[PDB]
Amino acid sequence: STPITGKVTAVIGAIVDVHFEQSELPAILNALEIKTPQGKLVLEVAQHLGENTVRTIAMDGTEGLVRGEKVLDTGGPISVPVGRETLGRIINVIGEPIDERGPIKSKLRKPIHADPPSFAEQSTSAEILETGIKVVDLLAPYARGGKIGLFGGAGVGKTVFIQELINNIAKAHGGFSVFTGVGERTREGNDLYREMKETGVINLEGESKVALVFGQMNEPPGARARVALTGLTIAEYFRDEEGQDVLLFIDNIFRFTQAGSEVSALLGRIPSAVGYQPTLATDMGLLQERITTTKKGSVTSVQAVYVPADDLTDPAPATTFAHLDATTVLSRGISELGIYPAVDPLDSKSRLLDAAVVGQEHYDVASKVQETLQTYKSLQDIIAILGMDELSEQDKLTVERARKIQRFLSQPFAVAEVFTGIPGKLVRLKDTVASFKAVLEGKYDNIPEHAFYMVGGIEDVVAKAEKLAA
Amino acid sequence: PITGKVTAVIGAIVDVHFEQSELPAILNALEIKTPQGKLVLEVAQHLGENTVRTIAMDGTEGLVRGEKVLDTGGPISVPVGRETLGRIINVIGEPIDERGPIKSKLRKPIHADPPSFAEQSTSAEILETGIKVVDLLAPYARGGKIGLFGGAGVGKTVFIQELINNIAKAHGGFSVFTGVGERTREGNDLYREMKETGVINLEGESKVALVFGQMNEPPGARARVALTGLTIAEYFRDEEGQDVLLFIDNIFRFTQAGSEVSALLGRIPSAVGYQPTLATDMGLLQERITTTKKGSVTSVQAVYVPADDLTDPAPATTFAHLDATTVLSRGISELGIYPAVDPLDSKSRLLDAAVVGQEHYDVASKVQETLQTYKSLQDIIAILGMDELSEQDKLTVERARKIQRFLSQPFAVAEVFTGIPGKLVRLKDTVASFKAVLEGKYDNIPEHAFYMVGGIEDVVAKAEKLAA
Amino acid sequence: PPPVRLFGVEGTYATALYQAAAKNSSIDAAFQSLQKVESTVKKNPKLGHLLLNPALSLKDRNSVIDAIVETHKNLDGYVVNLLKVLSENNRLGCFEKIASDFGVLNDAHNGLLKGTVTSAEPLDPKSFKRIEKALSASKLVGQGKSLKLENVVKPEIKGGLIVELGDKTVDLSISTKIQKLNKVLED
Amino acid sequence: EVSSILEERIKGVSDEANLNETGRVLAVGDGIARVFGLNNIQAEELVEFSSGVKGMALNLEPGQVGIVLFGSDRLVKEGELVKRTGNIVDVPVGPGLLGRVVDALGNPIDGKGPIDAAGRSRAQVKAPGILPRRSVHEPVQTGLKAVDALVPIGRGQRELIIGDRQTGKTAVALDTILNQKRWNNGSDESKKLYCVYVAVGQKRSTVAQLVQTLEQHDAMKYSIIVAATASEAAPLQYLAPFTAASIGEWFRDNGKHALIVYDDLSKQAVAYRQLSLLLRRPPGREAYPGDVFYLHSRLLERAAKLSEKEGSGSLTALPVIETQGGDVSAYIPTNVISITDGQIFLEAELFYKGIRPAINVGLSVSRVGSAAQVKALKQVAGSLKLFLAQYREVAAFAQSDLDASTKQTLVRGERLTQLLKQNQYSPLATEEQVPLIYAGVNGHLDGIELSRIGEFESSFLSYLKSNHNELLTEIREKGELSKELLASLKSATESFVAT
Amino acid sequence: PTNVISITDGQIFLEAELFYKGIRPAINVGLSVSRVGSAAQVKALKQVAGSLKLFLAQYREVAAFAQFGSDLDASTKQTLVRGER
Amino acid sequence: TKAQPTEVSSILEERIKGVSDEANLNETGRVLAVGDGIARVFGLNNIQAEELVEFSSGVKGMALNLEPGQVGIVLFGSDRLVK
Amino acid sequence: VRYEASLRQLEQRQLAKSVISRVQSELGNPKFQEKVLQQSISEIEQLLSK
């Protein structure tokens, strides 16, 4: 800690201006520690206002800040510790255990800031992640090293969707995962922590295949903003140095936008459209750019996004929409229809779905599905006024297949045993292609609608028909 | 010589610090010496403390703070003359026709104040065109503002050309085509077309003078192009007596240009962004466009409706100045009817019985009534069947469809474009033509005879030829 | 008139003072008295504290001026009128700012340049003379304006020197070179 | 050692600059260093910091010049000497940027060694004059049958591509480039279009995929990719289309032709917004700066088909604007729509309905049309325009008891629409565009069942190659269909249709 | 409201029109959600109210079709009748 | 610190020169910065509120804002003839 | 293979701190006097070459 001592000059919020003395210059993005009964209050230097008077953003609370309070300068971006005991413990923004499993093993420390790898470095994705969720697999197949994006409602099983992913994909792949919570509830935290202790992904004796960095919304906006950057560096340690692929998970990135929006305003920087940061685009962009499939390690982000008032053309979701490789929308309506998952199939679209890429059969089947659903959707309006009473036998059959497909999508989840109490199903990729193919061919047009409802694979569709048949 | 050193270049808003008591006035024109020749900055504020805030006409492309400035001493003085006819002139009053230094005798300041109440002529006059449709259903006005609607592709440009031709026949007056926010493609086309249609004939005589204001030109210069054009027009009106017809392109881009200048000057943007001085600027422009004792300017303006909203402040403000609106329809041009004018959407405020004649008013009213009834009649005549027509109803339908054909008359300009040499019909003969057809005297004349010919006399001949 | 504008920050005050006292040709005298009263003011700790502080009222500010003219008598009544102006405008915190600026205007009018030979350590008299020579030899000092250079020691420049004057610098700081070296060997 | 060589490079830097103007940062916050000094600075000067960061000087204020850093704040700090490079922004322009991916600065981000270029020229330079511009007599073919006929495109022509977000927005652009491989192979340099793709916004991973696709189709050997990625700074993003245009000027000036695709200018706008708000420059409609219009207009008028005295050359342009909800009313779209000469408007419903390209013909327009259209292709697609117009109207009368006339329209219309569908990344030759459309126009294939259209199409092409690749080559070389060619073509179609 | 919606573990939207419709106290059950919460009610009450949501959701869909005035099949009118009661 | 209407160098030069009275600032003012059809005048201490003032710019204006040491007249007339 | 490559990178960073150690050595040495003097006279020569 350099003998640059500053005395606070203005407590006006999280923004705290410090007055370092003459002949001693700070540097942007430093870390100030202020001795307090709050340990060290950490201030990230974010502007220089000259005359050795900085304007810095607080991480921790500014209550009881004494005017002219000595501020040590620890310099540079805050450096957390990283190791492999990062795995299996919850870690706050300033890099300290929240599960109180003692300090994370500090083999290395790294700064929370890091810079995106160069264009040259990038190695492009071209592999297919499997989710075991049939709708997801057919109509928006995910790709390893991807940038999956879970746009969705108010924790409308947003968490549940992720829980299923962790249950299937995370456990399955040997690589690490990092579960990062930006401004999320301690109720949710306790459930997730407990749940992932239960699923054993978190092993509190022995290594965990997940790490946690839970930043919660009671924390001041500054801490909420810069929790993400910390998480990225942990992934980088895994990605680069451990070499291991990271199935990253972050929650919720609208909260990342909101946190940033607040400190834009507080920094005095005029906020752009719908009150977002003036630097909204570039801040999102830097975050997104850091996350990529690198030769050292392929990073597969799954990023929760909360669509404020279910409007995704609001600039913050819409801007993020570009950066995401494999967008997914989880809608209330489909949930309400009783279809789990709540995914809106038309709107959920992954970049890879190209004909050769997913294979001609998969593509052709999916094209037929898309048409079947789109036809059904067109016919819903017709049914609305005209009724289904003068629209073709063929149209009726297409509609019948669509109702069946609609409830074929209804597939339970193991992590909605908590909810529904119905154990989930994992259906092989080949099997899903086959099962959709059969339906379209009309092979299963003698199978009851409810014998597609809340079932898995082809065997199950037939089996629940047999159950009803009996 | 007044001099000052540039002491800021925040954007194209350049603060110049002048030696004391040698502080320009607002609306003066400054020329800042540059390897670009000069950059003309116009003093739009006195910021006091021997500094100003100025706007640019010629963009700032590297400027070392402190460059010497020379003050012309007042609003830019643009060349004027009867020698400035057929010269393409950029905003700073300099040739872009590349026919070298503009042939001119005098130059005159671009800012000028509208003629007095006394110098406004107390009585309105009616201008005439060969276009019958215009002279009947939206009578052309001598002095007036007639705001054009309907984009190029209906032959908007050809309509504009037609007007130049008509002005030459009608008076032998002049015109100035001012293009604000003009695409460089469109500018090329227009110059070539004007040369081709001989309204500009470089070797020959060139009546219309061109002022082209491209979108690449600074917003300040977009605002000032119109005022330059007006000065040229006023030289014609005031110092040659001659009536003028002044085309303006998008008045959205006039507004937009003004909006930018407000924002740059820091002035609070009024509703829908537009400058708080929007109305007054239009007012100056359209009160300098008026009928003086000497002559009268007349202005055709082009209104690129913003978002097709007529509820936006700028279109409403424009409509206040407008006396007539000419509403070209592409449906009408698609009926092969050139003129492409939408007859029932073309309206003028001069159409009153006293103004245009009681007979003419009644004839016009009848043509409007005929057409109005025809459209409505065709609605249910088409649906119910054409054999549901009464004798009266088919008289109206027949009359209308014959009139619709009678409206189509080739234009001299559209000699090339239709392939048929022009037809112009004078105002007295316009009234006469509709009277006879209305009185069904010439309702023994068929639809195709009426098609693509001028006045009543012409279609007596054409009826015989059509049959032959 | 100002021989070179110093853009505001009560340097508009310095300018005004300068042109007024330049036309009364009492700029050296003004500067000397201003420096002299400022020196003893600085060496008074209540006007090396509360003069800075905006504690003083209207009435208390007026009474501070009265005490100041006890501290010295005469020498440019335009700088005594300046005291009134500054007290009334309540800017006494930027008083020395004006003084420095007035000095710059004064010695610029006289034709004297200031400069510095910021270095990591004190430099030879040989170095001083050589630099004085060098600058006069170079067109940078063309003469008609004097040359003054103040060598200052800043250990921040870890070695080498940077000469600065007229916005003309020659910078041989080793610290910067070390930085670039470090950067390429962290590539 | 790797260390010794790296030091050897550093060792060769020891030149001292007696900096005529030096400045020192007073305060740097928000990437807006406010520097004291720099009195001799020319506007938009390139300035080099102590950090080595480069900047431009948008605000020249009297006491301080508020430089905008092209770099990042992480390596910038207060008090820093700010050397004045003293040269307003310039970028290398020249021949050897073909098949090269460069960032805005002109540094290769593909890192395929130093750029080969003939000069570094300023990028704030203006657009060709009215007299220096003459009509577009040249068509250009994208290899997409509908685009080339319905919305025929020319050279030195600017036409918008306004459409739904990344729904093969990039795909439409790439398709042109692939057909330009054919034309590039073609010797005439009006047919050697040296394409420039300006990836604005688009992240390095996304552009890496583009790069890979381009390398796969060997398109790099005339392509230039000016790349301003998401990580790349907003000043770089702001000046990126201006910079790109300058590269284009070298080709245009050389009398050659080229095509510059600005994708997407919407993200350029956001960068200008970011800059303006941070420079306290006045915000404007939709919180975009007021003179954002002034920028776009300058850029888009540089593109143009020059006069024949100006060496008959051009810079074709096809700007891409991404409409987030199809909001053409949005301030940046409205402005661009006026400036551009044409629009292509892709519709989401069509995308969903598997029509990919999802182009909606109604809201697609070309305002130069047949001036830049192949004569052969004009002949056999006037009918097509009219037919499709009827099909659109009678598509909504597809909903019970319907006249035979209506049904004929539906049969012809559905089949035509299906015929104009094209699988992504399949370009075509004009000599094969003309036959297929001719058949559809003559309703030969409108007779053929909808399901059988696709198989017929490919078969027809092979059949045409077998029967008369003389006809195809003749169509290609003559470019104008003689009555005899239309006869012969009809015969071939009839013969094929019968099988 | 946006900020609060995120914080809270449920939203209990109430609808004024439905107050007037006669559900007073009113509720807007389409927007009444519990983001987290899903069990914390009586065990007995969990068993019974299982398809109450489904019935109502179906009632909502059916009612929309019904409001046009179009003729309704008996299956829809089972839903409509069940929902109304 | 902050802008003041006594920052204007000519006003300031007189004050330093020990000149600050003599009806210059009572029954007359001298115009400062001007444009936007409003003028900021120094003096006019004997001005009435909503007075008519006649400028030596051939224009008359109605005093609107009586501010400490400055008055912001509103110019009933064009700024062309005002400096 | 991965840690083998990593050790090479780690070595470059190790050698970076060894350069830093050598920086302190230079600044300890009367290279601090003599090479600063060398810079002084070099700057004089450079400034004379202006």
Same domain for D424 and D353: no
A406 alpha carbon, distance to own chain's centre? 26
Does residue D10 fall inside a structural domain? Answer: no
Q: d(Cα F33, Cα F26) in Å, to the nearest integer?
A: 19
Residue-level length of chain B: 468
Per the structure, the complete domain to which residue B101 belongs is given by: 76-350
Q: Which two tokens stand for residue E28?
A: 């807007």
Helix (H, G, I), strand (E, B) or coil at F45: coil
Beta bridge partners of D202: none
Closest CA to B18 of B61, B77, B66: B66
Q: d(Cα A76, Cα A29) in Å, to the nearest integer?
A: 6
Q: Give yes or no for a contact between B110 and B224, defined as CB atoms under 8 angstroms apart.
A: yes
Same domain for A159 and A97: yes
DSSP for C117-152, written as a single string: EEESS---HHHHHHHHHHHHHSTTS-SSSB---EEE
DSSP for C100-116, written as a single string: HHHHHHHHHHHTB---E
Total number of domains in chain D: 3
Q: Identify the burial level of A182 via C-beta atoms within 10 angstroms of its C-beta, where 0-12 means exposed, 13-18 middle and 19 or more buried.
A: buried
In D, which residues are within 8 Å of B250 by CB distance?
338
Does residue F3 fall inside a structural domain? Answer: no
Q: d(Cα C43, Cα B17) in Å, to the nearest integer?
A: 41
Prior bond of A283 cis (ω within 30°): no
| Residues of D contacting chain G (CB within 8 angstroms) | 2-3, 16, 18
Check if A184 is active-site.
Answer: yes
Closest CA to A218 of A264, A255, A261, A248: A255
Residue F65: phi and psi, rounded to 5, are -115, 115
**Looking at the complex, does the CB of residue G19 fall below 8 Å from at least one CB of chain C?**
yes
Closest CA to C7 of B45, F1, D64, F13: D64
Residue-level length of chain G: 50
Q: d(Cα A465, Cα A444) in Å, to the nearest integer?
A: 10
Q: Give yes or no for a contact between C43 and C74, defined as CB atoms under 8 angstroms apart.
A: no
Indicate which CATH number applies to the domain containing B61: 2.40.10.170
Same domain for B235 and B174: yes
Residue A142 parent element (H or E): strand A142-143
A10 alpha carbon, distance to own chain's centre? 37
Chains near D with 3+ CB pairs less than 8 A apart are A, B, C, G
Same domain for B393 and B383: yes
CATH architecture group of domain C11-110:
Orthogonal Bundle (1.10)
Q: Identify the burial level of A343 via C-beta atoms within 10 angstroms of its C-beta, where 0-12 means exposed, 13-18 middle and 19 or more buried.
A: buried
Closest CA to A348 of A291, A305, A299: A305
Same domain for B119 and B17: no
Give the list of residues 6+ apart from residue A317 with CB closer than 8 angstroms, or none: A151, A254, A305, A307, A308, A311
Between the alpha carbon of residue D312 and those of residues A133, D185, D190, the distances in Å are 59, 20, 9
Four-residue CA torsion sign, G19, G24, G30, G32: positive
Of A33, A62, A77, which residue is a domain's last? Answer: A77
For residue B106, count other CB atoms closer than 10 A to its CB: 11
| Closest residue to A387, CB basis, from E11, E33, E71 | E71
The catalytic residue among A184, A219, A236, A262 is A184
For residue D458, count other CB atoms closer than 10 A to its CB: 9
Is A29 in Cβ contact with D423 (below 8 Å)?
A: no
Q: d(Cα B135, Cα B428) in Å, to the nearest integer?
A: 10
> Do at least 3 CB pairs under 8 Å connect E with G?
no
Q: d(Cα B81, Cα F35) in Å, to the nearest integer?
A: 33
Place of tokens 């956001």: D270
Give the list of residues 6+ apart from residue B100 with CB closer than 8 angstroms, or none: none
For residue G21, count other CB atoms closer than 10 A to its CB: 9
Mutate to test the interface with C, among D2, D20, D22 (most CBs of C within 10 A): D22
Q: Do the annotations mark residue D499 as ligand-binding?
A: no
Give the list of residues 6+ apart from residue A200 with CB closer than 8 angstroms, or none: none
Q: d(Cα A5, Cα B403) in Å, to the nearest integer?
A: 92
Residue-level length of chain E: 85
Of B30, B57, B75, which residue is a domain's last? Answer: B75
Q: Which two tokens stand for residue D218?
A: 């060997």
Q: In the 8-state DSSP scheme, what is residue A210?
A: E
Helix (H, G, I), strand (E, B) or coil at B31: strand
Residue E81 parent element (H or E): helix E74-84
Is G12 in Cβ contact with D2 (below 8 Å)?
A: yes
Same domain for B198 and B59: no
Does residue D9 fall inside a structural domain? Answer: no
Which residues 141-200 of chain D have a CB within 8 Å of chain B? 157
Same domain for B108 and B251: yes
Q: Give yes or no for a contact between D286 and A273, defined as CB atoms under 8 angstroms apart.
A: yes
Is B46 in Cβ contact with F35 (below 8 Å)?
A: yes
List the Cα angle A435/A330/A373 in 5-degree steps: 45
Q: Which two tokens stand for residue B227?
A: 């005022």
Same domain for D348 and D260: yes
Closest CA to C2 of C111, C139, C108: C108
End-to-end CA distance of chain F: 28
Helix (H, G, I), strand (E, B) or coil at B196: helix
Q: Give yes or no for a contact between B11 and D281, defined as CB atoms under 8 angstroms apart.
A: yes
The catalytic residue among A7, A40, A185, A368 is A185
Does residue D76 fall inside a structural domain? Answer: yes
Same domain for D344 and D212: yes
In C, which residues are within 8 Å of G30 by CB distance?
none
Give the list of residues 6+ apart from residue C109 with CB closer than 8 angstroms, or none: C3, C18, C22, C27
Q: Give yes or no for a contact between F34 and F79, defined as CB atoms under 8 angstroms apart.
A: yes
Buried b (16+ CB within 10 A) or exposed e, A82-91: bebbbbbbbb
Of D373, D397, D430, which residue is a domain's last? Answer: D373
Q: State the structure-solving technique.
A: cryo-EM
Nearest Cα of chain D lies from the Cα of G15 at a distance, in angstroms, of 9
- Going through chain C in order, the beta strands assigned E by DSSP cover 116-119, 150-153, 160-165, 168-173
Nearest Cα of chain E lies from the Cα of A230 at a distance, in angstroms, of 23
Same domain for D317 and D232: yes
Helix (H, G, I), strand (E, B) or coil at B281: helix
Same domain for A174 and A69: no
Q: Give yes or no for a contact between A7 and A54, defined as CB atoms under 8 angstroms apart.
A: no
Q: Which two tokens stand for residue D36?
A: 């004291």
Q: d(Cα D436, Cα D460) in Å, to the nearest integer?
A: 8
Helices and strands, counts by H and E, chain F = 1, 5
E2 alpha carbon, distance to own chain's centre? 22
Indicate which CATH number applies to the domain containing A316: 3.40.50.300
Same domain for D342 and D379: no
* H-state helical runs in B75-218: 132-137, 156-170, 184-196
Residue F39 parent element (H or E): strand F38-43
Is C94 in Cβ contact with F16 (below 8 Å)?
A: no
Residue D341: which region, alpha, beta or left (left: phi > 0; alpha: psi -120 to 50)?
beta
| Closest residue to C89, CB basis, from F4, F9, F17 | F4
B125 alpha carbon, distance to own chain's centre? 18
D287 alpha carbon, distance to own chain's centre? 26
Q: Give yes or no for a contact between D358 and D137, defined as CB atoms under 8 angstroms apart.
A: no
Q: Which two tokens stand for residue D89?
A: 């922004």
Q: d(Cα D384, Cα A98) in Å, to the nearest integer?
A: 69
Per the structure, the complete domain to which residue D430 belongs is given by: 374-499
DSSP for B228-249, written as a single string: HHHHHHHHHHHHH-----EEEE
Same domain for B366 and B239: no
Q: d(Cα D399, Cα A379) in Å, to the nearest integer?
A: 10
In F, which residues are within 8 Å of B113 by CB distance?
78
Q: Which two tokens stand for residue B461?
A: 């001949």
Check if E85 is active-site.
Answer: no
DSSP for C115-126, written as a single string: -EEEESS---HH
**Helices B278-285 and B219-240, packing angle to 10 deg:** 30
Q: Give yes or no for a contact between A6 and A71, defined as CB atoms under 8 angstroms apart.
A: yes
Q: Do the annotations mark residue D170 as ligand-binding?
A: yes
Q: Which two tokens stand for residue B10?
A: 């925040």
Q: d(Cα A395, Cα A380) in Å, to the nearest integer?
A: 11
| Closest residue to D290, CB basis, from B184, B215, B263 | B263
Give the list of residues 6+ apart from residue B151 with CB closer than 8 angstroms, or none: B304
Indicate which CATH number applies to the domain containing D462: 1.20.150.20
Indicate which CATH number applies to the domain containing A359: 1.10.1140.10
Q: Give yes or no for a contact between B374 and B353, defined as CB atoms under 8 angstroms apart.
A: no
Total number of domains in chain B: 3
Q: Identify the burial level of B118 via C-beta atoms within 10 angstroms of its C-beta, where 0-12 means exposed, 13-18 middle and 19 or more buried.
A: exposed
Place of tokens 């420079």: D279
Is F18 in Cβ contact with C78 (below 8 Å)?
A: yes
Residue D378: phi and psi, rounded to 5, are -65, -45
Total number of domains in chain F: 1
Place of tokens 């090339």: B416
Give the list of residues 6+ apart from residue D463 with CB closer than 8 angstroms, or none: D492, D496, D499
Of A299, A333, A352, which residue is a domain's last? Answer: A352
Nearest Cα of chain A lies from the Cα of D392 at a distance, in angstroms, of 16
Q: Give yes or no for a contact between B349 and B139, defined as CB atoms under 8 angstroms apart.
A: no
Q: Which two tokens stand for residue G11?
A: 């070595």
Between the alpha carbon of residue D11 and those of residues B217, C181, C185, D7, the distances in Å are 49, 8, 12, 6
Same domain for D262 and D393: no
Nearest Cα of chain A lies from the Cα of D277 at a distance, in angstroms, of 6
Q: In the 8-state DSSP scheme, what is residue B267?
A: P
In A, which residues are within 8 Å of E54 by CB distance?
338
* H-state helical runs in A353-420: 360-385, 393-408
Residue B351: phi and psi, rounded to 5, are -165, -10
Same domain for D397 and D342: no
Same domain for B118 and B26: no
Q: Which two tokens stand for residue C21?
A: 């006292």
End-to-end CA distance of chain D: 72
Helix (H, G, I), strand (E, B) or coil at F18: coil
Q: d(Cα D276, Cα D278) in Å, to the nearest integer?
A: 5
Of D48, D65, D87, which residue is a domain's last? Answer: D87
Give the list of residues 6+ apart from residue B88 with CB closer than 8 angstroms, or none: B95, B96, B97, B191, B209, B210, B211, B212, D130
For residue G22, count other CB atoms closer than 10 A to its CB: 10
Place of tokens 């069940």: E82
A273 alpha carbon, distance to own chain's centre? 24
Does residue F76 fall inside a structural domain? Answer: yes
Helix (H, G, I), strand (E, B) or coil at A231: helix
Q: Which two tokens stand for residue D490?
A: 């009809």
**Binding site feature residues of A for ATP:** 152-159
Is G46 in Cβ contact with D3 (below 8 Å)?
A: no
Buried b (16+ CB within 10 A) or exposed e, F41-72: bbbbeebeeeeebebebebebebeeeeeebbe
List the Cα angle A376/A379/A384 in 5-degree steps: 125
Same domain for A450 and A358: yes
Of D56, D87, D118, which residue is a domain's last? Answer: D87
Residue of B nearest to F80 (CA): B26
Q: d(Cα C79, Cα C21) in Å, to the nearest integer?
A: 9
Between the alpha carbon of residue B311 and those of residues B251, B270, B273, the distances in Å are 15, 15, 14
Q: d(Cα B60, Cα B12) in Å, to the nearest integer?
A: 6
Q: d(Cα D235, Cα D239) in Å, to the nearest integer?
A: 6
Q: Using H for helix, E for strand and C for coil, what is the string for chain D?
A: CHHHHHHHHHHCCCCCCCECCEEEEEEEECCEEEEEECCCCCCCEEEEECCCCEEEEEEECCCCEEEEECCCHHHCCCCCEEEEEEEECEEEECCCCCCEEEECCCCECCCCCCCCCCEEEECCCCCCCCCCECCCCCEECCCCHHHHHHCCEECCCECCEEEECCCCHHHHHHHHHHHHHHHHHCCCCCCCECCEEEEECCCHHHHHHHHHHHHHCCCCCCCEEEEECCCCCHHHHHHHHHHHHHHHHHHHHCCCECEEEEECHHHHHHHHHHHHHHCCCCECHHHCECCHHHHHHHHHHHCEEECHHHCCCEEEECCEEEECCCCCCCHHHHHHHHHCCCEEEECHHHHHCCCCCCEEEEEEECCCHHHHCCHHHHHCCHHHHHHHHHHHHCCCCCCCCCCHHHHHHHHHHHHHHHHCCCCCCCCCCHHHHHHHHHHHHCCHHHHCCHHHHHHHHHHHHHHHHHHHHHHHHHHHHHCCCCHHHHHHHHHHHHHHHHC
Pairing of strands B51-56, A326-330: unpaired
Indicate which CATH number applies to the domain containing F33: 2.40.30.20
Prior bond of E25 cis (ω within 30°): yes
Helix (H, G, I), strand (E, B) or coil at A178: strand
Give the list of residues 6+ apart from residue G2 with CB closer than 8 angstroms, or none: A243
Give the list of residues 6+ apart from residue G41 with CB closer than 8 angstroms, or none: none
| Sheet with C168-173, edge to edge strand ranges | C150-153, C116-119, C160-165, C168-173
Q: d(Cα B263, Cα E52) in Å, to the nearest integer?
A: 59
Residues D421, D425, D430, D432, Cα dihedral to 10°: -60
Give the list of residues 6+ apart from residue A354 with CB closer than 8 angstroms, or none: A363, D424
Q: Give yes or no for a contact between B225 and B210, defined as CB atoms under 8 angstroms apart.
A: no
Q: d(Cα B444, Cα G49) in Å, to the nearest integer?
A: 103
Q: Identify the burial level of D121 via C-beta atoms within 10 angstroms of its C-beta, where 0-12 means exposed, 13-18 middle and 19 or more buried.
A: middle
Q: How many Cα atoms occupy the beta-carbon half-sphere of A410 within 13 Å?
A: 20
Same domain for B217 and B357: no
Does residue D172 fall inside a structural domain? Answer: yes
Q: d(Cα A89, Cα A79) in Å, to the nearest integer?
A: 17
Does residue F56 fall inside a structural domain? Answer: yes
Indicate which CATH number applies to the domain containing D214: 3.40.50.300
Q: Using H for helix, E for strand and C for coil, what is the string for chain G?
A: CHHHHHHHHHHHHHHHHHHHHHHHHHCCCCHHHHHHHHHHHHHHHHHHCC
B to F CB pairs, distance under 8 Å = 38
Does residue F5 fall inside a structural domain? Answer: no
Closest CA to D388 of D355, D418, D366, D358: D418
Q: Give yes or no for a contact between D233 and D192, defined as CB atoms under 8 angstroms apart.
A: no
Q: Which amino acid is at D159?
A: E
Same domain for A371 and A407: yes
Q: Which amino acid is at D228?
A: A
Q: How many Cα atoms occupy the beta-carbon half-sphere of G28 within 13 Å?
A: 6
